[PDB]
Design a protein around this ligand. Sequence first.
Ligand SMILES: O=C(O)C[C@@](O)(C(=O)O)[C@@H](O)C(=O)O
Ligand code: NA
Length: 742
Amino acid sequence: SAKAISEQTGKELLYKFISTTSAIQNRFKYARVTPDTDWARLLQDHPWLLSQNLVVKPDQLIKRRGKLGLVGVNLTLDGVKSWLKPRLGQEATVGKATGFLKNFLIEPFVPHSQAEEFYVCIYATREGDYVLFHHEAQKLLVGVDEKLNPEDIKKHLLVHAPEDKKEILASFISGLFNFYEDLYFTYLEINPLVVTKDGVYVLDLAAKVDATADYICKVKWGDIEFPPPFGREAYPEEAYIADLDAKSGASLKLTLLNPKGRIWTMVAGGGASVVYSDTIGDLGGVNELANYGEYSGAPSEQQTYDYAKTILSLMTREKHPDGKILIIGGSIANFTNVAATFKGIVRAIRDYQGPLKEHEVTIFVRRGGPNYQEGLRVMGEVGKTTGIPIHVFGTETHMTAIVGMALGHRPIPLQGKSTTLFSRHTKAIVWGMQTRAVQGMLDFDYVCSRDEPSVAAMVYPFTGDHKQKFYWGHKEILIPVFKNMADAMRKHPEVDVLINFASLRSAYDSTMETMNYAQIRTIAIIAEGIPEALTRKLIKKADQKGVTIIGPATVGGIKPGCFKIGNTGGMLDNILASKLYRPGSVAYVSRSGGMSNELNNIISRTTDGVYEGVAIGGDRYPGSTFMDHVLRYQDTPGVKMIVVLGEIGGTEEYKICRGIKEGRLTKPIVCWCIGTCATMFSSEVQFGHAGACANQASETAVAKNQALKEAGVFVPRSFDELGEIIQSVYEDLVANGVIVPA
Ligand SMILES: O=C(O)C[C@@](O)(C(=O)O)[C@@H](O)C(=O)O
Ligand code: NA
């Protein structure tokens, strides 16, 4: 996800790495002040503080500090100390948010005139990075993998600028853009840039970097800090979890909202965790909600133990009169092992059992997934042996039902790429060492009564060629593994799908390499954590070649009767339970992988069942969008209704609205956009999925659910009535003859 950095951090990167050819002034002339500052050392380290007038302001991701009057301008050093004296340590109000002014920046005062002030901004979109310039806006798009033409700067951005400043402005803008790409920024605004006879001064800097690029930018970023939004604090336990996430193929996230709240969550999945938070917010619990976070991607027992013990420690610092509740939730997992993770949580609960009884904690559990029956048994076990109240619920209880149980009372003390991607004839190559996931596909293929396994070969460049044993029914079979992708392709021209399990570090090159083989028309990219600038380049090549990308950061998708991507839908018992071995009439698309297995469950209980599901993944720029898949479903005869599970952030869902108005979409669509709680928070909350950042009022789930409903989409009041509305629509289509069940 993209994360904001402080003005000081941004300026420090700029002073270290922007090309010296632009005439940057006051390089490294800044001084950080916090309550514990040693002013003597400060004057030693920054002797220019004693020899010129100064500007001082807080550096805590407050915007428009000037018009709020949080800027002391043209002061001597003692004028700065007096200016700080009634302000440092004191709380201020900015928007809905209130916090302490704890971090200030002193820089030199730069005399200038209005005419020497300029505005520059660079920001990322799917189609490239825009550059904005304004004297006192001109706009230029640098396309994905293109260069900034310094004569487009002069001819398009600087058309109204004084001719005597154009050459230094163009040099600065060129240098700023190279600086922006190389350090993986996604947003960079300088307002004002001051240009005088003596060179360029950077008076204000706001910026965001793609934090997933750390393995690329380590050296230059150094020990980079990502401040919380104004009105929250940073917590050592958040960094611990961040540290565990860095050491994990799995995803592990934690944000503390109100450490004193009595509602705590430990929910699996980035989607489900937002849905539980939504439900909590609809029942008035938001002010008591202590955290947001999630785990997913199959963490080990030990990782889950370490995550869980962090939560239990945080919830046993002080007592609440009414006790506290721990919501241990999630969807029906595709891939995460419920036994191993819940054994981790159980070990954490035992190790914290004294503090949990003392703080009057009630625990509510709802989970499904692989091995979920053992998991739920050991969960109920530790409740019996510790005497802590633990109320355990499985797949036949609705995902979010434990929330109302727990909160209802205090416990008693342009042409599309392709319409059809998969069929009963699909043959795939799997990139990676992924025996278990491949066996899970062959199991699906067998119970789907396919004539042939869906996996024809595998590629893994870190071993030599060999054959790998799998079971086909109960027969042993062999599947070739190739060191070289070239060998796998020329020996399997029948193959048209590649499922890429490469790690995030190797995913870009392995996917670009696949796209040199025109025989491959669909690629599933599993890995989470690919830098967005790299995904944009994957998107550009795939669009040039006509290749459908599903992912990144997804489990994939499933087509009952025909084909499933990797770990989608999980083990045999969930495939049978949710009847995913044969088709029904309902097609769906979600960002979230975990929630798509919940849709599998919900749709199978309320309809003839799933016809096709896709999870487009959580990243900011998915390889294929909601609309792409909804178009396929509109043009697919066997689909009779469409279910979209949307999400706060971006404006994709409004294309559905337009498709309806234009007459392009005509089957019945059901849609729910998750993230409605985000508006109830006093500070923005970055959810699990990289995409889930709302940049304007229209990107909120609430606005999207409203626009969708006005355009004739069927929208439930909340997620926990989605299953109801899906049922009723199906029933009308049965009553109208459109669907004829078996
Ligand atoms: O454990 C979960 O509920 C989430 C997830 O791990 C899953 O297993 O369904 C999903 O994020 C995935 O990546 O498969
Ligand atoms: Na990780």
